[PDB]
Amino acid sequence: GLTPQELEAYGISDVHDIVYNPSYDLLYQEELDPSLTGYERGVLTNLGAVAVDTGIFTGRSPKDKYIVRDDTTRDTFWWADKGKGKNDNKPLSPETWQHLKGLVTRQLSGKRLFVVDAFCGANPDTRLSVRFITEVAWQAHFVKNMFIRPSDEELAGFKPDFIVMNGAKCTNPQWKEQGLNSENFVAFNLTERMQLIGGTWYGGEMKKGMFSMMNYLLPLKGIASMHCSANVGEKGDVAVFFGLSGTGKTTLSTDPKRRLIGDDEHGWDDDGVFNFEGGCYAKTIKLSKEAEPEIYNAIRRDALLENVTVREDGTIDFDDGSKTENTRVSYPIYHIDNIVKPVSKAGHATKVIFLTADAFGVLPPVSRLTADQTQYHFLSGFTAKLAGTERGITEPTPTFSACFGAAFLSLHPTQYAEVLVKRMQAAGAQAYLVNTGWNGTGKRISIKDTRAIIDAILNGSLDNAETFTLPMFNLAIPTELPGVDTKILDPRNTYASPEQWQEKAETLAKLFIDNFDKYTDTPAGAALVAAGPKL
Ligand SMILES: Nc1ncnc2c1ncn2[C@@H]1O[C@H](COP(=O)(O)OP(=O)(O)OP(=O)(O)O)[C@@H](O)[C@H]1O
Ligand SMILES: [Cl-]
Ligand SMILES: [Mg+2]
């Protein structure tokens, strides 16, 4: 536990009521207190899970992310202003940090506080011991779900080496004079080992905040830090699935035929692949119980639904994106029946899958990548969206995000590439590119087809298939696969002619080529251009 004096040491004063390590039962009763006002309020759904609204923010706010630039971070951090590529690592002064810390600590002073101690990282040797402090019960619940829950023995010996202070209810009145983006802030200090949050209530800031810290500390010790889901077969064969948001990492790793290691954040050290987290954070927009039975089944007491529409009768309309398209549910990982336990880790990955949702409808559902293509596509980090849907238009809009997670990278993309390649080479890993997005039908590839494709990757069916080369992107693709619609395997088949596919392929190829140009200032980078699409 901790005393009011211990909180005083952090700068938080006059705390009279302290809830240390709140139980799931307490969090349930706290959320449902009928006297709660505003965004703290929870409502009970017919599935038995509590639902909350996360307020004005229903996703992360990268424009409000700052890292204190000091002698510890100056020469290692991938800074937004250093001329080494676009990122969100905006530099913050130590003086401005102290002002933000004053805002948050005063906001939390004189309040009833939840204190949640948890781990980030499955392995004792590299895990962070994180202490989270909040005045909002559902925020405490989110962290209880998403981080690793210590045992009673671990709690007795708990020594934090990172503090996360959530001051969602405060804002920064001096932001203009400080040169910041807004009155909100998500700030990190690697000297004081602390994260401060102001203005946004969104729980993902804590989750991805700690991921950003692991992404800083682990590769500097030779450990890959990866934006991927992961699972393992009965024989100990491990797969990792990289991809940007909405590409299928959580959906596809939750597979009845595999033991789930984790759905979002993993390390890769000398012993194998390990989860940083204690829970999963599923997307619920248009959720289908038939299509995603395990994720659906995880929505029960102790899960926490976010921003969903709950009807008067307590039923949920999963199709309603009126609050946000980013509706979510978090749950502790043991709400999934087939998981790796008691520790979320396994051996070395031998299958590396890059998921992408191609709104341009160009990329094949599945292709086997060469070693050089693996590096090219990892640095590229492509996905796309139909941005114009609400206006009745396509407007395919590309996103290139290095390492399939540039928003969370604390070091240069090439540092993540180097250590991933080292780990893959040692393991004899093979890499694959999977389009979970669109084809010439203007519809997304079915979850059924995609799962069958993943099965074929994992069981060696794809590796043994007759393949040919798709032009332009030069991707090795199969003629047929068990349980997969044969028609979809060649992306040209869903257009009126290959020439109509090619028009779109040329557009997309040019986007890749222009994006990759920034990596060609080194000889290694320049040499990968040949592995990219070619007009
Ligand atoms: N063929 C498909 N494969 C995977 N997901 C699909 C497919 N078709 C539709 N979807 C939908 O796409 C979304 C995939 O979301 P998921 O939560 O798996 O993304 P994620 O990669 O985990 O994102 P994040 O990084 O934000 O956690 C879900 O809404 C899912 O129902
Ligand atoms: Cl992302
Ligand atoms: Mg996910």
From Swiss-Prot:
Sorted UniProt keywords: Acetylation, Allosteric enzyme, ATP-binding, Calcium, Cytoplasm, Decarboxylase, Gluconeogenesis, Lyase, Magnesium, Manganese, Metal-binding, Nucleotide-binding
Effect of D263N: In PCK51; altered-activity mutant that catalyzes the conversion from oxaloacetate to pyruvate (OAA decarboxylase activity)
A single cellular component GO annotation: cytosol
Residues annotated as binding ATP: 208, 227, 243-251, 292, 328, 444-445, 450
Modified residues (N6-acetyllysine): K82, K518
EC annotation from Swiss-Prot or TrEMBL: 4.1.1.49
Residues annotated for substrate binding in this entry: R60, Y202, K208, R328
BP GO annotations: gluconeogenesis
Free-text remark on how the cofactor is bound: Binds 1 Mn(2+) ion per subunit.
Main location per the UniProt record: cytoplasm
Cofactor(s) demanded: Mn(2+)
Regulation of its function: Allosterically activated by calcium. It may represent the only case of a monomeric, allosteric enzyme.
Factors inducing expression: Induced upon entry into stationary phase and by cyclic AMP (cAMP). Repressed by glucose (catabolite repression) and by CsrA.
Segments crossing the lipid bilayer: none
InterPro entries in alphabetical order: PEP_carboxykinase_ATP, PEP_carboxykinase_C, PEP_carboxykinase_N, PEPCK_ATP_CS
Catalytic activity of the protein: oxaloacetate + ATP = phosphoenolpyruvate + ADP + CO2
Entry's localization field: Cytoplasm
Listed pathway(s): Carbohydrate biosynthesis; gluconeogenesis
Coiled coil start-end: none
Annotated positions binding Mn(2+): K208, H227, D264
Binding site for Ca(2+): K144, N145, F147, G278
An example Gene Ontology molecular-function term: ATP binding
Membership in a protein family: Belongs to the phosphoenolpyruvate carboxykinase (ATP) family.
Function, in words: Involved in the gluconeogenesis. Catalyzes the conversion of oxaloacetate (OAA) to phosphoenolpyruvate (PEP) through direct phosphoryl transfer between the nucleoside triphosphate and OAA.
Database matches in HAMAP family: PEPCK_ATP (MF_00453)
UniProt-recorded name of the protein: Phosphoenolpyruvate carboxykinase (ATP)
Organism: Escherichia coli (strain K12)
